[PDB]
Recover the amino acids of this structure.
């Protein structure tokens, strides 16, 4: 559904943002958090969404769509507007409806959110998950409108599969290239580049890593090879940040530094 | 939630009941919710709008599907979504659309009434436009899943006069089946493009005769009285005509309940001959290619658009009414 419609999609026409526009909006939150802490937080909630999705036995495309909604929401809004801890499972819930998976039950959604944060994220959350289904349904009305109802999201998994099929190296490269596609969600790449470009960048790094010579195949593509090199740099940078970051030891402090919602007049 | 963010959004939030006048003006009611003929409160327009409150509270699978798909689809033969209103206070979702004065259910009913008491290529123009819109949906891998005359809207007086608009993209999946393909009635576990193509054929036969071709009297995915009505018109499908009929989940139920000889003199030819439609016409041959029992032996919407019937005089027009004064009365209201 809406497969080759990328150049005429809401995703391309409205949700491929300008990097300077993105950084400018981020400045509201860069008062409370450094650029490094903001990235580390964006990696953290990417990992929370992934763990939530695993718990609910949801497909990768549902998780990837959930991550994009989350990224999109905090690209325009501050971390204080809505609690990301309520926002992340809200994104999962809506992404499953959009992706025709189903409506996760009240009990099952709240219990997955509770169990995931308790078992896997206790280093960052000492307290139990505090939200109820009324909070998730409320947050959903907000997320829906503050995305201009843009629900159809294109990911790089679909072009990547076509690329490695063309190459004929599906067995050798797809497991690694697919993995690198998952990692690009720890970064803003989905908000800056078309999915097929992130797919080419992920396939390129996979080719380097496994020492497969694909120079000719890549030269035979009618693509802006500078844009691909920009994406590759972000992917390489991500791995150095991965090495130098211990979320388990730094995330409780990074979550405390984060701005919090102003309460109603009392 | 941040209070400052909450009050600011609340102040910006456009309300459906503040922007439009629609109370009392309900033109449709069904599983999709309520449709209204609305007018702008600000008066800087004078245009008529179709305003739909979606059935139930919250973002249902159905509401989710319609919003997600309509947001991306852009075709002159598919209804255009203009706005979405999220009534936070009652969790109701409203959708704004241009107002189609006519639909195929109301036009077909008008003709049926007249018989008891269609300019040159109005039927042909309606078919080409129905096919054109479905072809665009199918190109984008979107199935309608529930094509029927009521959701085939047609614009009245205005800049889009006599243009078809396919409506209701909210038939999401995980008592009347006149438009359900025979494979669905035999427990087919998936919706396909050929299911929409079968449905287009039923509309084409209803436009050519005024009668629902598979008109049958009023849970289980298998429906006997409807399958019987299909065989009364088409006949019993030979083994060679649909080899994978054996592969259908309800095939041995069909063998137990039906007998080939019951429908021995049944054909689409004999049905259309009774309803004064020449079997040697290019309209018959196209109709027959859409109404094929076997989904894999059923033509595509792209292939239907290339049929020589559309090259035969008269050509389809962009205005199905083709200048002619629309005899059809405007849509009457309802009471809830
Ligand atoms: N959604 C939907 C839907 C409508 C119908 C239906 O039975 N009908 C007959 C009665 C008048 C309805 C109407 C009139 C004008 N616009 C719309 N619209 C504009 C877009 C959509 F809201 C339907 N509907 C059409 C079936 N599904």
């Amino acid at each position: 559904a809406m497969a080759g419609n990328f150049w005429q999609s809401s995703h391309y026409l409205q949700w491929i943002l300008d990097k300077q526009d993105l950084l400018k909006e981020r400045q509201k939150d860069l008062k409370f958090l450094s650029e490094e802490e903001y990235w580390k937080l964006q990696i953290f909630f990417t990992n929370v969404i992934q763990a939530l999705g695993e718990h609910l036995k949801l497909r990768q495309q549902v998780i990837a769509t959930a991550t994009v909604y989350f990224k999109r929401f905090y690209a325009r809004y501050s971390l204080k507007s809505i609690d990301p801890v309520l926002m992340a499972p809200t994104c999962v819930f809506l992404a499953s409806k959009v992706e025709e998976f189903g409506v996760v039950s009240n009990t099952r959604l709240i219990a997955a959110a509770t169990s995931v944060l308790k078992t896997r994220f206790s280093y960052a959350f000492p307290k139990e998950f505090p939200y109820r289904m009324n909070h998730i349904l409320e947050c959903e009305f907000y997320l829906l409108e503050l995305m201009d109802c843009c629900l159809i999201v294109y990911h790089p998994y679909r072009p990547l599969l076509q690329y490695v099929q063309d190459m004929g190296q599906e067995d050798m490269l797809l497991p690694l290239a697919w993995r690198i596609v998952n990692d690009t969600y720890r970064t803003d790449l989905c908000l800056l580049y078309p999915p097929f470009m992130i797919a080419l960048a992920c396939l390129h790094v996979a080719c380097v890593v496994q020492q497969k010579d694909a120079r000719q195949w890549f030269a035979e593509l009618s693509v802006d090879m500078e844009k691909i090199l920009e994406i590759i740099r972000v992917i390489l940078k991500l791995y150095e940040q991965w090495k130098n970051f211990d979320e388990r030891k730094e995330m409780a402090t990074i979550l405390s530094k984060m701005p919090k919602p102003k309460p109603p007049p009392n | 939630m941040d209070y400052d963010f909450k009050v600011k959004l609340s102040s910006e939030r456009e309300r459906v009941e503040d922007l439009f006048e629609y109370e009392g003006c309900k033109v449709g009611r069904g599983t999709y919710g309520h449709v209204y003929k609305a007018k702008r409160k600000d008066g800087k327009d004078d245009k008529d709008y179709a305003l739909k409150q979606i059935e139930g509270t919250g973002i249902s699978m159905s509401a989710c599907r319609e919003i997600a798909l309509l947001r991306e689809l852009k075709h002159p033969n598919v209804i255009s979504l203009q706005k979405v209103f999220l009534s936070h206070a009652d969790r109701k979702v409203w959708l704004l659309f241009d107002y189609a004065e006519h639909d195929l259910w109301h036009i077909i009913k008008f003709h049926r009434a007249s018989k008891a008491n269609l300019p040159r290529g109005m039927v042909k123009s309606l078919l080409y436009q129905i096919l054109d819109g479905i072809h665009y949906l199918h190109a984008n891998w979107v199935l309608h899943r529930d094509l029927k005359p009521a959701n085939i809207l047609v614009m009245g007086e205005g800049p889009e006069r006599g243009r078809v608009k396919i409506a209701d993209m909210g038939f999401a999946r995980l008592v009347t089946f006149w438009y359900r393909a025979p494979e669905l009635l035999l427990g087919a576990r998936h919706y396909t493009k050929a299911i929409d193509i079968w449905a287009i054929g039923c509309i084409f036969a209803e436009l050519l005769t005024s009668e629902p071709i598979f008109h049958c009297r009023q849970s289980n995915p298998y429906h006997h009285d409807q399958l019987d009505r299909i065989f009364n018109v088409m006949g019993f499908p030979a083994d060679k005509d649909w080899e994978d009929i054996k592969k259908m989940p309800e095939h041995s139920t069909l063998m137990k309940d039906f007998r080939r000889n019951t429908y021995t003199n049944c054909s689409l030819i004999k049905y259309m001959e009774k309803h004064k439609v020449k079997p040697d016409s290019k309209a018959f041959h196209l109709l027959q290619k859409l109404l094929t029992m076997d989904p894999i032996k059923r033509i595509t919407s792209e292939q239907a658009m290339q049929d020589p019937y559309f090259l035969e005089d008269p050509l389809p027009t962009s205005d199905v009414f083709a200048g002619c004064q629309i005899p059809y009365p405007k849509r009457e209201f309802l009471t809830e």
